[PDB]
Amino acid sequence: RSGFLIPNAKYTTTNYFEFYLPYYWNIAPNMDATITPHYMHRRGNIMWENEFRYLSQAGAGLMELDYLPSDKVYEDEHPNDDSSRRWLFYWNHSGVMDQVWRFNVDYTKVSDPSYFNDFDNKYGSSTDGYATQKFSVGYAVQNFNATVSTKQFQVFSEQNTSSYSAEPQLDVNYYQNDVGPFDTRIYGQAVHFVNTRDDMPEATRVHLEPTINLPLSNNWGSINTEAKFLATHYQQTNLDWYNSRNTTKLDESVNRVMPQFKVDGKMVFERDMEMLAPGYTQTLEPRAQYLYVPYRDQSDIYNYDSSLLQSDYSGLFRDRTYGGLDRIASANQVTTGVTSRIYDDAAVERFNISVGQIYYFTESRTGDDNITWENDDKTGSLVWAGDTYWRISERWGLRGGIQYDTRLDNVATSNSSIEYRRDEDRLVQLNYHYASPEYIQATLPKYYSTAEQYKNGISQVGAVASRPIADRWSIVGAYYYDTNANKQADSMLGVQYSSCCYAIRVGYERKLNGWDNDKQHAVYDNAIGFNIELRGLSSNYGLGTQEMLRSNILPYQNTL
Amino acid sequence: EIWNARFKVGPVRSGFLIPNAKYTTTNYFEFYLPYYWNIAPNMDATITPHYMHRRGNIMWENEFRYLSQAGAGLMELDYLPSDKVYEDEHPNDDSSRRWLFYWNHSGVMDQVWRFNVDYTKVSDPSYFNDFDNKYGSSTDGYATQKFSVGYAVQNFNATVSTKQFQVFSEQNTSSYSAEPQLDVNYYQNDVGPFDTRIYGQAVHFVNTRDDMPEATRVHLEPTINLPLSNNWGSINTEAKFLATHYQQTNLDWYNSRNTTKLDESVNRVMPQFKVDGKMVFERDMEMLAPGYTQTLEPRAQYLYVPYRDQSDIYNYDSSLLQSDYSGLFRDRTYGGLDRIASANQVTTGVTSRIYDDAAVERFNISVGQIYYFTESRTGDDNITWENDDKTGSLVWAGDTYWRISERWGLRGGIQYDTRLDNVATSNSSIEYRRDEDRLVQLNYHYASPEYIQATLPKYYSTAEQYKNGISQVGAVASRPIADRWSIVGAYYYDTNANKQADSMLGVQYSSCCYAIRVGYERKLNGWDNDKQHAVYDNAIGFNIELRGLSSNYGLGTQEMLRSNILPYQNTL
Amino acid sequence: LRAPSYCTSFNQRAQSNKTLTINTPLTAGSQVVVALTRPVEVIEVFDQTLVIPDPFYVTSVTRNGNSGITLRGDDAYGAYSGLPQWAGVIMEVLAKLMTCRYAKRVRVNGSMALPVSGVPFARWDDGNVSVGFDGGSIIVRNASYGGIDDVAASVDMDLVIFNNNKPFVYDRTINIGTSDQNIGNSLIQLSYTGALIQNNGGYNHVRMNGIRMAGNNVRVAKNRVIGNYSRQQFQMPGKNIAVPTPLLVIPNMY
Amino acid sequence: CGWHLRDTTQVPSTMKVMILDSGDPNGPLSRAVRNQLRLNGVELLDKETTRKDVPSLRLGKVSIAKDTASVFRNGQTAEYQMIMTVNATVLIPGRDIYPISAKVFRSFFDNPQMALAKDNEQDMIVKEMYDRAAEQLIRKLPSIRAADIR
Amino acid sequence: CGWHLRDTTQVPSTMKVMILDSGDPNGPLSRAVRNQLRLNGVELLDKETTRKDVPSLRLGKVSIAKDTASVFRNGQTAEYQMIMTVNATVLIPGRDIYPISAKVFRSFFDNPQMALAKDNEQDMIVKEMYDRAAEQLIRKLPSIRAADIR
Question: Which chains touch D (3 or more CB pairs under 8 A)?
């Protein structure tokens, strides 16, 4: 029924005093509302939050209209601004209708790019660069489905305002099989790339990807010969400003027609492990591939929605290197890989290892041949991969991954994680995240690999641990190092005392906030909290351990 | 004007205790984390780290509550190793360490002897002003070190005790201690048809300064009574002997800058005489109410003390006692054996109490006056007045207490005077209190401008903040709304200035596990000194109380009614 | 510009309740000029077991008909009574003539006794200090400080002292006030210009006042600390008395 | 109108001999109560010496409480108001125990004085209030007689 | 080392006929499990069949959660890591009910100045995490049958 909820007040180092009085409106039993006044001392006025969950034929969703009419601190930073109103929106409709029709929404807007950096929400964080405002709709059945999308973005940084967006994104995806021994499928696209500026290109694209997939089956083997085509029309316009600057000028209508061949294949072996540990089996799955794409000169098409993809063990056998229909690369390679499980008596997979290499024949060219590798290579066993996942017990886990490389003779990426979890309130975790600096230049744009911030790659060594002392306290820790610069990146530490009537919680964080241009050294952000939660009649309490872990900039994620 | 807010939340086995935080506009975020440390059946300390953001360091408030063979006890060693504000407000003292010490030992022995200690050494003169210390006694800004012994039986007494001051070099206040002070009392009755008692006091006053006089006083007060009780009346006449011997030294500074010429040895012997009487009547009051009773009770008294000139005895301890209705039938004008006045007077009075059927008193009015045959002279009479009349019915009084019902009430009190020809005081009230929560009250307080001139120090009569007297009117109300909400209020409004004096509002939501309270108050907080108009301070408070699971219940009223600068009192 | 010679150097206490009656032979139409060096004395007056500080400044100077001058005082609160100890030098414009018996630039580091006895005229340039001359020493204190401490200061001043070697010639007399009164290239006198009582630090803080010459204009500013009578005992209304007695000014010739 | 003096409306004839048992029998209150009782004929039987069948005044706990009541124009306390509640319970031998009370009101200006001289004033004021509250306990004695007779 | 070729398949001979139960049989997840099943020679039947001895899968709920996993020295995130959880309950007639689960961990680099091209990639990461999760489900079928036998 329409009635208020349990208040909550906290002393922070950023707003001094804050108080929440969450009301709970009510209407017919599909909708509701949780209008929540929220007073902030340093800010001045009281923030208004207007969450509105609902449910209908289409599906469930929620809204949020956080609104602070006047902010004192923001006025201090920017006294030239006429007003200092702050607001946030978040619409997240998503649901299927009539078992065929489908809708999707994901919207978020802010008053100024510096919203999430000084406020705290569940819908974004300071470690953000853009807020995604996309709408979607479409109806899907077993064979045919169409969808109309309107992706846009709200990039925060003002040093480069140019952002792209897709007005209509129509995409038909027919499906039909059992045509002789083959299978068929059709794709399609139709876009209109708008830009938030005035002196940037626009476009109009149409695509007609068919397929002729031919499947083969065996007791152990699976050879899959495939062949698809590709067409891409264009109507590029508004190139007047860009023609002067770049050497290779953009042009009008462009057709891009190219086929593609692919061959897959694998087999499954078996071997009883009773020689060392009786009762276990073990398989072995070698897998080979060959790819071939003709070369088309694509230096006269602006890169709207293409980006170079990562390379994990399963990423070796992927079709394209650029996710998106703008810079389909051209290559002819092989790809090899063997996987080795060791099941147990109950046929439960308890360990597996893998490796794979993508030896090329000629080269990887797109017609945009200007990217500078650390040391350019033509062909050979350029890139190797690898992964292994060992389930030590029910309460332990180990997971790895590595992408070795002979082109630059440096490991491009690697990541590991080992975790001991007993219950939801007692865990310990390690994790590693590496990305060699040569990879940063070869992937991210030029500006990154010339500023000091985005230059040395990433070398993280984190640690998480929690422990329920006695049965009322829930101490939680976290500390993420950066061994490249030998300076910490994040360090969180909280303690919560949970009784049957209230719950008091402390906090401490040292996230990285920004980069000081003058001294060219990192700027940290120390924050302290002291939260009082008044619960009382609530029967369920919870230690809150799972909530404190997911509060810093690098939130916890269970690796098992 | 000046707005300022306050946001607090905290509570009302060698482990910790519930911590209380606090945030205020001046002296910002402040956080206590106490810790109990029971270590023995008769020892238990309490170490309490205390963080003050404004001074930027942590003080350590400790305790040592002990109950060993001696007796009760307490300790306190608050210690702030470094102070940030202090180094800005006192750039003469090198170190900025702030500390306080306390000790409150006691303990009986054979249920006759006794002991007391009250050590309170502090660090710097501006300690008490900066911190609101929990334990510690300050006298005139100084920190005292009172010791004491004792002895007591059904009649005899003895209270030899000393008291010192921790006076620094930045303080110029003048104060008198008493080092030591033996006090003997003897109470023996039924000496024939009489009763007897003896008082004694050997004292030694020493000033904090080094230019004020010292002394040495011996006093004796043997008295003999003679009660005579009838059934309808009463009488009681007594005589007393007063002896006092002084020994005044360090008179060099006072005598040079004055002409009174303090003597060096003074003996004062004054015999006292007093006769008291009462008479009680009665009448059935069946004409108005069934079976009630009225009682008219006259009372008279005659007092006589001779005049001895006391200009050559310094005023070590003598205030000037004020008046009420029952103050008419008194013995001394000045409080203390230092300026014993001289009187030759008769006092008269009338009461009238109306009893109901269960013999429960309901009403009582009173009237009284003092007739001075000879003007009361003490040898140093320098009081300002508004008339030259000195003998006769100078002062009148009054009283009333009507109890309308079990949940109503009324009160009075007037002090008419003829040395200025107008009312001098008119304290009054009326209240309707149902239970702890629902209550309504009205007040009134008057004090004529001539009264302020005739009693308070002489710079009251020439200051705009004091010279106009008092004529304020008040009102206090409270009423719970639901079973968990309470509302209070108050509004005191001056009538000589048509400007309010205090105005408070409070709302409390109280449950079994927590309770939140807000507040508002618009008080008077000093004079301008520049444009000659008062300055108001507006404060808004917000408090969260962590009520643990127990029987500590209360809607919050009677605790927020005592928060403004004019607290609430039952007056029923 | 005149050169009055001399008559007296009284340093006594008031004979009656706030009345000084220094007597000296006078000539008809002499236009008596009296320069006061102790306008104000803080006196502790007793009031029924209470020691109260109380400034006692001087208000009016009246010639006693060709036989001397009289000085009428008035305390701060106008209620108590006492006999102050004002002190000054009496002159007639129409028999020794005062002379410039000391004139050097010195730096005073908080308190400096007078090298020779006389009526000292100085001139400095600093904004955070104030200068007052009680009766035997040039007292300099930090004036921008607000706390109850007696913070000292150092200022560099041009000191001139006259007594019984250019002759003493004076000029316009300035009534020192709370506003900037420009004097230009001239030397101000040196004396206390009142007293001040303020609720500060929990005490009835009592200070004396003094000249504050910044640029070339003078103004009353706070100075040495007299005492701190606690506010737990009694609480006093604030006062910022500035004496009405004028200060002599001389041109920069000496 | 006739006024027939009084008819022994003093301490009821029943309570003409009692025992003044008190937590602290040597304090100021106990001696104050004793005075009024002796002046009212009552002889105080030595503390629990007779066997039984005599009432007892069981003096309880006192509570002095000084509060501000008026302010000058600069927000400075002008008048205080002391209030002193004093409990008591009369034991009637066998019958029952009946409660009594007292509540004395005193107001006065806050005169700024010394500390040795302001203590002596606040001691005389308290001692006075003890006499007036002890008096009120020797009334309400005709009351318990009327409440025990029914 | 003696390794033969694994004769026993990955879909137990019992479950060569399956009934696919799901709230949304048209969405992305169903399309994956249909294709994985046909790859193993499994004849999927709808709910209107008369055979009540055919085991039936039940695709539960999915959950896509992406969080940052490595921060640049300027403060903005560098490397994301997305997870995905899908529950499923297989109902084999004649015995009890058995649950299965699948988690997929995948990553990619953030690039704030290529937002639209960093969302046409996040639609590819997911549409490839809908096909390795499926494989996980159709690889515990042996477990379910084996543990069910006992």
Answer: B, C
